[PDB]
Amino acid sequence: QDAITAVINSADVQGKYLDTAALEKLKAYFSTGELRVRAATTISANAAAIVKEAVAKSLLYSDITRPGGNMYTTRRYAACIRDLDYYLRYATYAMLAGDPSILDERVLNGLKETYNSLGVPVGATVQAIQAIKEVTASLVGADAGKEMGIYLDYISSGLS
Amino acid sequence: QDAITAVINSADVQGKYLDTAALEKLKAYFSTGELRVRAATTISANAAAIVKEAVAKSLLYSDITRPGGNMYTTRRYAACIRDLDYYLRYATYAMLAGDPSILDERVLNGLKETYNSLGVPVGATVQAIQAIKEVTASLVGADAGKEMGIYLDYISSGLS
Amino acid sequence: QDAITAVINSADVQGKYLDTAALEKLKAYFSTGELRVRAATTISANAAAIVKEAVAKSLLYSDITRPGGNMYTTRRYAACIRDLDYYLRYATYAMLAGDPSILDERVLNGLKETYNSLGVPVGATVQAIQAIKEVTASLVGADAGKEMGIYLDYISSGLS
Amino acid sequence: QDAITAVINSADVQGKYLDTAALEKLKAYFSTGELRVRAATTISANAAAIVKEAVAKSLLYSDITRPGGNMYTTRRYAACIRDLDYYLRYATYAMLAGDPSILDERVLNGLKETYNSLGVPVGATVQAIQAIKEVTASLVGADAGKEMGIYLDYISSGLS
Amino acid sequence: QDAITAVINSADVQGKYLDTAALEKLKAYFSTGELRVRAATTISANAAAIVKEAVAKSLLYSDITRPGGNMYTTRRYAACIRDLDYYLRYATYAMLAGDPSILDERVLNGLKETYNSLGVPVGATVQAIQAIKEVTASLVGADAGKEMGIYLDYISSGLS
Amino acid sequence: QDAITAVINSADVQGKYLDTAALEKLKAYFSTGELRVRAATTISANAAAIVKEAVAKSLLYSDITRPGGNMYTTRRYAACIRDLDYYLRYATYAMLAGDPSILDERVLNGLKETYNSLGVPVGATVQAIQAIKEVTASLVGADAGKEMGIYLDYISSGLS
Amino acid sequence: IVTKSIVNADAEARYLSPGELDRIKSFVAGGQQRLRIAQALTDNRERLVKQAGDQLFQKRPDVVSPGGNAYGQEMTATCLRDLDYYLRLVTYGIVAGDVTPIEEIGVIGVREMYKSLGTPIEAVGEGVRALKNAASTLLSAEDAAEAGSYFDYVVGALQ
Amino acid sequence: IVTKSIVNADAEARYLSPGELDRIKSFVAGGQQRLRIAQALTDNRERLVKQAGDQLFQKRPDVVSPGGNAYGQEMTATCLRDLDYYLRLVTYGIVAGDVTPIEEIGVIGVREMYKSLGTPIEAVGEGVRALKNAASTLLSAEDAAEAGSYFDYVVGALQ
Amino acid sequence: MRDAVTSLIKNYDVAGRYFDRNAIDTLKDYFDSGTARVQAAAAINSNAAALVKQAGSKLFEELPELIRPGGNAYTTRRLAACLRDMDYYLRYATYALVAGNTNVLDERVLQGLRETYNSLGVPIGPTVRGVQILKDLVKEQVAGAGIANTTFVEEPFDHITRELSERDV
Amino acid sequence: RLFKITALVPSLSRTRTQRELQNTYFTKLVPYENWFREQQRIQKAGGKIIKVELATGKQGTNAGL
Amino acid sequence: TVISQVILQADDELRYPSSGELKSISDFLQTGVQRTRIVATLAENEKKIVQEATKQLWQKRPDFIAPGGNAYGERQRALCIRDFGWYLRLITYGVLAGDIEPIEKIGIIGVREMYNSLGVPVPGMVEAINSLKKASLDLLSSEDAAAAAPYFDYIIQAMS
Numbered sequence A, B, C, D, E, F: 001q002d003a004i005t006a007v008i009n010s011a012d013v014q015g016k017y018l019d020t021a022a023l024e025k026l027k028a029y030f031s032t033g034e035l036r037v038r039a040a041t042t043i044s045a046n047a048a049a050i051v052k053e054a055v056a057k058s059l060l061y062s063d064i065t066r067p068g069g070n071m072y073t074t075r076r077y078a079a080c081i082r083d084l085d086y087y088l089r090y091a092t093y094a095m096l097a098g099d100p101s102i103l104d105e106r107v108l109n110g111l112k113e114t115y116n117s118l119g120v121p122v123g124a125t126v127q128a129i130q131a132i133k134e135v136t137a138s139l140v141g142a143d144a145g146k147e148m149g150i151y152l153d154y155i156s157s158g159l160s
Numbered sequence G, H: 001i002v003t004k005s006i007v008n009a010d011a012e013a014r015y016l017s018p019g020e021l022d023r024i025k026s027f028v029a030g031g032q033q034r035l036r037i038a039q040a041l042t043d044n045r046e047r048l049v050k051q052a053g054d055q056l057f058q059k060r061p062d063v064v065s066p067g068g069n070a071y072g073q074e075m076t077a078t079c080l081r082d083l084d085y086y087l088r089l090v091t092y093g094i095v096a097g098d099v100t101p102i103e104e105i106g107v108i109g110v111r112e113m114y115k116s117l118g119t120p121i122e123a124v125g126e127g128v129r130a131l132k133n134a135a136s137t138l139l140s141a142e143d144a145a146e147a148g149s150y151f152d153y154v155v156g157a158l159q
Numbered sequence I: 001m002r003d004a005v006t007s008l009i010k011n012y013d014v015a016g017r018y019f020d021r022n023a024i025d026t027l028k029d030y031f032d033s034g035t036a037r038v039q040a041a042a043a044i045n046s047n048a049a050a051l052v053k054q055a056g057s058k059l060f061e062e063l064p065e066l067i068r069p070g071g072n073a074y075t076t077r078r079l080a081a082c083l084r085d086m087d088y089y090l091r092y093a094t095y096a097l098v099a100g101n102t103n104v105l106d107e108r109v110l111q112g113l114r115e116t117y118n119s120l121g122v123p124i125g126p127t128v129r130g131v132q133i134l135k136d137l138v139k140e141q142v143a144g145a146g147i148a149n150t151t152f153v154e155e156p157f158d159h160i161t162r163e164l165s166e167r168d169v
Numbered sequence J: 001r002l003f004k005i006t007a008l009v010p011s012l013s014r015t016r017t018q019r020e021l022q023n024t025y026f027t028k029l030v031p032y033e034n035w036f037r038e039q040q041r042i043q044k045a046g047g048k049i050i051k052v053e054l055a056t057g058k059q060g061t062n063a064g065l
Numbered sequence K: 001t002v003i004s005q006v007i008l009q010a011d012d013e014l015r016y017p018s019s020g021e022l023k024s025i026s027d028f029l030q031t032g033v034q035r036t037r038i039v040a041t042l043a044e045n046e047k048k049i050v051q052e053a054t055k056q057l058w059q060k061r062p063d064f065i066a067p068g069g070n071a072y073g074e075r076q077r078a079l080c081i082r083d084f085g086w087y088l089r090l091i092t093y094g095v096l097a098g099d100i101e102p103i104e105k106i107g108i109i110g111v112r113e114m115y116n117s118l119g120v121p122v123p124g125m126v127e128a129i130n131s132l133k134k135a136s137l138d139l140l141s142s143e144d145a146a147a148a149a150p151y152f153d154y155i156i157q158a159m160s
């Protein structure tokens, strides 16, 4: 769903026409879409650098990459990079849509089930998503970093 | 299963031969098969008219077809017509078999799970099946309408 | 998994090199592999005779093959032979691997779910696997019959 | 091929001698050859009258002989008479042989290719062959008209 | 392929950069894309009306829909409507691409093989595509009807 | 084409002069031409004896020359001898040219089409060409029999 | 139109390609004209339903005739309510920029609904054509083109 | 009905089960009554098309009305020719004993044909109902039941 | 696949006309032949599995090379395939007996038979030879249980022959 | 809109085809318009449908799936 | 039975049951009362039938009575007695029922895999059911005997 599609749905289930508050919501979305698109472009620029900096901030040189940790095996390191790239990409989609429903529908659906099945540590994942959020808020600026951090904190809060 | 196949099964699991009570059951089925076939023919005549009259009796001009109701969207209206056609067709099959096991095996298996998953209202479905039963009992006569209403009330009772 | 692969995994998740206890485990496996291979060959010789003798010991002339029992229908007798051949074949695989993980991964995964869904009696299956174990321990000798009975009792214990 | 040659071929490809069923087939052919020859003589009598009556029954005073139709040009009318004379003559040959293989070999080989290349209407040809069949079944009698109509309907069925 | 993709390919296989003639071709395509899109929209409006008018112009009340013709059976009438809808839809795709390669790749590949296998008349198909072309050139105007008739005549010429 | 003409063509389509690898190829051909000519002479000696010995090895006293087989009729036996003489003669031409292109151009072009049209058995033809290859490799020696068997196996592989 | 590009790039494992970002930026630019067109169609709804019923019942009198479905005041009120629904979905499609939230609510199962209601679908298509003509008279040229876009989609969908 | 049992036992690798042989023997027994019913419907065709056109154009006058399809002598002749076709297919289904050779020629693609011809299918269903009523008046009770069987199949198929 | 009653329907449908007297005559022929055809098919169905074995026995009596080195029914792996082809020919001959046409044999048996038999190296002469051992045995079995005129039993095996036939005249 | 279904379909014809005899008990996600014919196909084999659960989708929402 | 056939068909293809199938239903319903009387006759005297059947077996084959056979030993000798009665119980169930498939499901599906690793040979079962067939059609009236013969010979061919 969108913010546009959410506004249209909320006006639809009442049978209501588009009143002035919904037009205010759509015009606010049409105002913010500029920096939304620019932020999505520069996040699509260097996603690999963001994931590299995030694991170098949070996960590297810990016991997690040591033997016994969950990132010791090299296929598990590759799976870690894959999961962080997923979090960043779906946070980009939720930032450009302006509605976190795609995070609820595609990422946060059965994820705690999987992470408790595999024995994946949840707190280290939350700290890695936090480091992702700090790196991309530094990279994109504060004004779009707020909206990026909202959906990354949404993923972090639903994960916990 | 049939009524014939149910009688054969009940005689089989005991290792019993066909005693006179089972022959009475089979001969009663062979007596009633005449009106069973005639009723199935005239129900196969005008199933669309029965479903149209049933939604015009029960579901139309309510809040269900208004916005907010479950039959507001036109794909949901088409799904409603599909479900009512299913109920009438499988009730025809159970009437001609003379045994409600195909309703238990093919319709009533995981249906409350689906209708509580989708948010489908159950009481409106029960009233729609009731209107189906009244329309086909008027259309076919009382003598076969009793046996049609038995399996339609079986669907209604298992749905609730 | 193997016993070799289990030893390598247990040495790997610590980051440990192959110490002398792991080399003892691998050398014990390389000592026992002789009778492992000979036992697997003579069990692959006459698996049908083992299954025939096991059903003649345990399941035949009971109420299970009488009408009302679960092995009355001839497709159910064929399914019974199929399940016993599966138990013997996967016990042969677990005997030659020297590690019961393939029983946990391929046989014992969702088997109680299936046997309680179909209404299959569990205690008669356990007694049939017991008769399988007695027949193959007689056929192969005591020294390999111990290791065959370990994995057959593993299947019997996980089934219960 | 003949009916005689077909019987000899079917006995030959097995290496079989002439058994009693083949002798029955040949003796039935030698019984029917009388009316076969008499029918072929009276069809060879007045083939032009048959073709004239057939076009007067089916094709004349339609839109086909009007401008725009396929029989408007006088060379196309002459080609129509030629094709109908071909159908009648080869049906006479197949009637006297008692085997429709010459129709498959000499007429029905590449005929739909030609009639779809030239834009010849197929249904009007089928109705013209039908009118040919009715006229010659009236002219020759019912008893030989059956065998004439078999090969004319063979041409009509292969044409469609 | 496109006209853009064809220009890029023709510049690529030489190793040539985009010279001024290729830029002229791309700028002519970017000039004509306006009426290309408007024509594709109004052809997507009423494709069923175009196919109905085309069969009413060319194929109806002939011998083709009479018995013996190839459109006599009602499944064959439905297949005829399907083939004409295919010709119109792929001509719309080739008009909006500005390059007839998709007609060569998706329609005209093995089509004469199929139409000579089934016995489909080719000349009636060509006249039906001609009637399609006249109806859509009337409906869309002359200026886009030229480009529509180019690809419809391409289908007609490759079919013959 | 030749081996000489193939070398000249491969040097020509690059615009390349005759480099030392092409001169090596031509000098190897000029070395092998001695036994090429001697082998072609002694194969031209007794081609009829080779074909006779090959049919006596492979095709004779089978079911193929019995009635029902494809070599039963005496014109079909003569056609079989003709086809085997063709295979041997064109294999002689390809051996003396040192390039199998004349087999691809003159024999293997539309041959599977013909042999599946006539119902000619392909596997018996392959075994007959194999018997031809064994007989001429015995007759000419091993050193030229290798090059003869290369082109005869080329015919056999393209036929299959 | 953002959900279209998102599920389009989501079936692939790739990101959103920046040409799709260009089309989203251009739609974001044109959103103000979209909102003005939607408000102009919003406030003038009853005129459009009146003129659509006018042109339809002048065009096809069988719905007026007692054998047709829209016979009587109740049935003709349900008819104009259906036209009101379709105008509402057209305004939704004008705002959304792509025909997904209007096809999801009005198109995707409409043929079997109108078949099991007895009404013909061609009369509904003529009603949406009358709505398109009345909105073409109500708007300017560049606005009527962009409204007749989605009206044209509905007319093609009901057939 | 023999092709039905043959392809039915042919999808399986089994032979024809002898209950199917019993149903073929019973159909072989009833074939004489089937042939008499088919000849009685055969020789009286123009009466049935006349009374079907009677009852249809009394029931639905919109085909007579100039907005409908069957307006004028040519279109009404094509209409009665369609009813003649359906009576012919009903006689085929009466002889064959099972509705396969009538559905293969008249049912399997009829909805899209009549949709792209403009005619409504419900009027065709009412025409076959009128044919069933006229043949019910023409035949005896056990003959009208067995004819109204296949007429009933066509009426259910066109809807 | 067309029945003996549906093939008339196709022949009369392509002309667009109704039933006439002649089609009703052949339908009366088929309808008084059907009661005998069902009994003949039941009699052949009853003893079919032993018919296959005796057909194999007489087929190996005829041509010795079928069970010799240079043959196709050499091992049991290659013998069971020839016996199930005997099973197939008998099965579709009974199908053509109850149908009354040769269109079942045309459409389901003969249509790809040359391609498989030339593909696998399978002979054709001994195949039709075995088909006729089958029909001699089937004629004996039909003449045993009642039915006097046996020509309708006689025709479908011969039609299978005439299309598996490598025609040399 | 996806459903999480647990089901169990025995073929009842493995003894005459001699198939692999693989597991017939699964927990799979199926999309919205696909679960319809999956329902129907699972009921064709007489299969028990244990539990139908919502994976993706809020019920009662109209636009945006 | 026939209602299983018609209902599984008409459900498998999503339509209502056709009317030729309903005519097959009601001629089965008339045939059922003769079916009831013949199954009552076979439920009268099964003692004589199994006694005859065992006696004709031990006149037919002497190897079951020789030691090392399957009837040797008192237990399996007493077992074969009731086994005969099981097969004629299935015959009674089948001769009532319209089809052989609910009896095929009970005793015909896996016969080979069951009896093969049970000890008893399938060439003896055909003699067993031949004796059962002789002992059933002596004890019935004539056309009832001709009606109940095909179920016996179905089981006979399904054995071998």
Ligand SMILES: *[C@H](C)[C@H]1/C(=C/c2[nH]c(/C=C3N=C(/C=C4\NC(=O)C(CC)=C4C)C(C)=C\3CCC(=O)O)c(CCC(=O)O)c2C)NC(=O)[C@@H]1C
Residues within 6 Å of the ligand: I060, I067, I073, I074, I075, I076, I077, I079
């Ligand atoms: C009996 C004491 C001895 C015997 C007799 C015997 N065999 C046959 C018939 C056949 N035997 C075969 C054999 C094989 N097929 C294989 O694939 C292999 C593996 C190498 C073997 C041994 C076949 C195919 C037949 C049928 C064709 C034929 O006649 O050869 C008979 C004839 C039976 C009959 O009349 O139908 C007899 C008497 N074989 C033995 O094992 C004993 C030594």
Ligand SMILES: *[C@H](C)[C@H]1/C(=C/c2[nH]c(/C=C3N=C(/C=C4\NC(=O)C(CC)=C4C)C(C)=C\3CCC(=O)O)c(CCC(=O)O)c2C)NC(=O)[C@@H]1C
Residues within 6 Å of the ligand: I066, I071, I072, I073, I078, I079, I081, I082, I083, I085, I086, I088, I108, I109, I113, I116, I120, I122, I123, I124, I126, I127, I130
């Ligand atoms: C036996 C009389 C002759 C013979 C037979 C033979 N056949 C095969 C192999 C196959 N036969 C078929 C035949 C059919 N398939 C069909 O669908 C139909 C119509 C219903 C027919 C007639 C097929 C498909 C095969 C391939 C095996 C398979 O079924 O997958 C063999 C085996 C060849 C081999 O060497 O493997 C044999 C021996 N051979 C004879 O000698 C007799 C003349």
Ligand SMILES: CCC1=C(C)/C(=C/C2=NC(=C\c3[nH]c(/C=C4\NC(=O)[C@H](C)[C@H]4CC)c(C)c3CCC(=O)O)/C(CCC(=O)O)=C2C)NC1=O
Residues within 6 Å of the ligand: B064, B070, B071, B075, B076, B077, B079, B080, B081, B083, B084, B086, B087, B090, B106, B107, B108, B111, B114, B118, B120, B121, B122, B124, B125, B128, J032, J033, J035, J036, J039, J040
């Ligand atoms: C053969 C037995 C059987 C049934 C019944 C069945 C029902 C069924 N009904 C569905 C939806 C639906 N079912 C209904 C039905 C109703 N809602 C109401 O308000 C009314 C009370 C009721 C109609 C009388 C509606 C409105 C939907 C649409 C939900 C949606 O798709 O968004 C769905 C979801 C997917 C789909 O339709 O294609 C299934 C599987 N499947 C089966 O296999």
Ligand SMILES: CCC1=C(C)/C(=C/C2=NC(=C\c3[nH]c(/C=C4\NC(=O)[C@H](C)[C@H]4CC)c(C)c3CCC(=O)O)/C(CCC(=O)O)=C2C)NC1=O
Residues within 6 Å of the ligand: C064, C070, C071, C075, C076, C077, C079, C080, C081, C083, C084, C086, C087, C090, C106, C107, C108, C111, C114, C118, C120, C121, C122, C124, C125, C128, J010, J011, J012, J014, J021, J022, J023, J024
């Ligand atoms: C490799 C591990 C594995 C096992 C074991 C397995 C079992 C299994 N056993 C089944 C049925 C069955 N299983 C049994 C077995 C028994 N019932 C009894 O009374 C005895 C106690 C026991 C035999 C010793 C029977 C009788 C059926 C038939 C139920 C039926 O199909 O109607 C089925 C249902 C479908 C089918 O057979 O084809 C499965 C999946 N699948 C597997 O993948």
Ligand SMILES: CCC1=C(C)/C(=C/C2=NC(=C\c3[nH]c(/C=C4\NC(=O)[C@H](C)[C@H]4CC)c(C)c3CCC(=O)O)/C(CCC(=O)O)=C2C)NC1=O
Residues within 6 Å of the ligand: E064, E070, E071, E075, E076, E077, E079, E080, E081, E083, E084, E086, E087, E090, E106, E107, E108, E111, E114, E118, E120, E121, E122, E124, E125, E128
């Ligand atoms: C996208 C390009 C494309 C085309 C065109 C195509 C055509 C096509 N047309 C077919 C049949 C057919 N095609 C026609 C069409 C015609 N016959 C006439 O008399 C008219 C001249 C013409 C209609 C204008 C008919 C009548 C059939 C029915 C034959 C049959 O199914 O029995 C078939 C056989 C199977 C089937 O329809 O479903 C194919 C594959 N497939 C393709 O992929």
Ligand SMILES: CCC1=C(C)/C(=C/C2=NC(=C\c3[nH]c(/C=C4\NC(=O)[C@H](C)[C@H]4CC)c(C)c3CCC(=O)O)/C(CCC(=O)O)=C2C)NC1=O
Residues within 6 Å of the ligand: B060, B061, B062, B065, B066, B067, B072, B073, B074, B077, G056, G063, G068, G069, G070, G071, G075, G076, G078, G079, G080, G082, G083, G085, G086, G089, G105, G106, G110, G117, G118, G119, G120, G121, G123, G124, G127
């Ligand atoms: C927003 C998506 C949506 C659609 C498309 C929709 C259609 C819709 N049209 C209906 C009735 C109707 N619709 C019409 C339609 C027409 N009058 C005619 O003659 C023309 C053919 C056409 C309009 C010009 C008529 C006459 C009725 C009343 C029919 C009856 O009462 O049986 C009904 C049943 C009564 C109701 O609850 O309103 C529905 C649900 N509902 C929806 O929620």
Ligand SMILES: CCC1=C(C)/C(=C/C2=NC(=C\c3[nH]c(/C=C4\NC(=O)[C@H](C)[C@H]4CC)c(C)c3CCC(=O)O)/C(CCC(=O)O)=C2C)NC1=O
Residues within 6 Å of the ligand: E060, E061, E062, E065, E066, E067, E072, E073, E074, H056, H063, H068, H069, H070, H071, H075, H076, H078, H079, H080, H082, H083, H085, H086, H089, H105, H106, H110, H117, H118, H119, H120, H121, H123, H124, H127
């Ligand atoms: C045997 C299988 C078969 C069918 C079903 C069939 C239908 C058929 N109906 C047609 C026309 C027609 N069909 C009708 C039908 C009707 N009049 C009405 O008002 C009612 C709705 C209905 C009959 C009572 C009309 C009015 C036309 C002329 C329409 C036109 O000219 O556009 C046409 C085009 C003209 C022609 O070639 O005859 C065909 C092919 N043709 C066939 O070969």
Ligand SMILES: CCC1=C(C)/C(=C/C2=NC(=C\c3[nH]c(/C=C4\NC(=O)[C@H](C)[C@H]4CC)c(C)c3CCC(=O)O)/C(CCC(=O)O)=C2C)NC1=O
Residues within 6 Å of the ligand: C060, C061, C062, C065, C066, C072, C073, C074, C077, K064, K070, K071, K076, K079, K080, K081, K083, K084, K086, K087, K090, K106, K107, K118, K119, K120, K124, K125, K128
């Ligand atoms: C309802 C279908 C059905 C039947 C009829 C059936 C029979 C059946 N026969 C059995 C054994 C047997 N069956 C026979 C049969 C015979 N011995 C002969 O010589 C004769 C040829 C033949 C018939 C008398 C013998 C000898 C055994 C003992 C095998 C053994 O235990 O060594 C057994 C295993 C032991 C038992 O439970 O009694 C069953 C279940 N099972 C079924 O599912």
